[PDB]
Amino acid sequence: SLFELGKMILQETGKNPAKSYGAYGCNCGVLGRGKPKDATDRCCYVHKCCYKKLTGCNPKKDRYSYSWKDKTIVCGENNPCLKELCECDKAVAICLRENLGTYNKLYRYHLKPFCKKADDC
Amino acid sequence: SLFELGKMILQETGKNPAKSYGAYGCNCGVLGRGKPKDATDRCCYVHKCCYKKLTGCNPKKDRYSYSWKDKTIVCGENNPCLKELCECDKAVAICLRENLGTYNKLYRYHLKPFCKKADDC
Ligand SMILES: O=C(/C=C/c1ccc(O)c(O)c1)O[C@H](Cc1ccc(O)c(O)c1)C(=O)O
C-alpha cells in the first residue's frame, strides 16, 4: 500500500515522499502516466506500468510485509501478488534514490493535466 | 475526477492544490480519514464522508461537467452520481477557501500513519 511505498522511498532517498514525489512531473503521484519529464519521472512511469500488470491484489490499499536488512529492502514472502507489489515498490524507491542528482524542484507540484500522452506500457 | 477537483480548489483558493492540499493533515489527499487536525483538515474529512454515499460512479477517475459562472462553481446536470460527486468537490473547494485563515503549513506533507482513527461519518 502507500504506507509501505512511502516508507521505502523514505528509507532509500532520505526524502519526505509526499513532498518530493507526491506530485512530481507527469508520472509521480496521482493522475495516471504521461511522457516522462526526466529520469526521476521515468522511475514513476515504470512503477505505474508495474502496477498496471499486477492482478489479484490492490496496489493502493493492500498492506504487505517487508524488512530493512543490511540497508536493503527485503520483500517478505507474503502471497505472490503482494510480493510482486512489494517488488514494484522497492524498485521505484531504488530508482528515485539513484536519480536524486537530477531531481528538479521545478517539476514538483507539476501541472499534470498538461502532460503529453503516455505510450502504452 | 481529480482533474475537476483540483481545478475547483485552484479557482476557489488561488492555491496550487497538490502543494497545499495533496498531503495535508489526516484527511487531505491520499489514504482515508482520521481525526482532523484543524478546520482545513475537517473540510477534507467531510469530503471523504461525502464520497462514501456515491453509487455508480468513481470519484477519482470519472469526469463530469461544471462551469465557473460569476466566480461560482456551477455543477452541470450530469447523471445523479456525477452531480453528487460534483457537489461534493464543490463543497470541499469552498470549505478549503473559507478556512485559509487558519491554514497551517506545519500540517503540510503530514505523518498520516500516526493519525488517530476517524469517527463514523
Ligand atoms: O522508519 C522510518 C523512517 C526511517 C527513516 C527516516 C528518515 C530518513 O531520512 C530515513 O532514511 C529513514 O519511519 C517509519 C514510519 C513511517 C513513515 C512513512 C510511512 O509511510 C510509514 O508507513 C511509516 C518508522 O518510524 O519506522
Numbering used by the authors:
A (entry chain A), B (entry chain B): 1 to 13, 15 to 53, 57 to 61, 67 to 88, 90 to 123, 125 to 127, 129 to 133
Cite, word for word, the article reporting this structure.
Despite their lack of enzymatic activity, Lys49-PLA2 myotoxins play a key role in myonecrosis, given that when they are selectively neutralized, most of the muscle-damaging effect of whole venoms is prevented. The muscle membrane-destabilizing activity exerted by Lys49-PLA2s has long been attributed to the presence of basic and aromatic residues situated at specific positions in the C-terminal region of these toxins (residues 115–129 according to the numbering system adopted by Renetseder and colleagues).
Crystals of the PrTX-I/RA complex diffracted X-rays to 1.77 Å resolution. Calculations based on the protein molecular weight indicate the presence of two molecules in the asymmetric unit. The homodimeric configuration adopted by Lys49-PLA2s has already been demonstrated by different techniques and is assumed to be the biological assembly in this study.
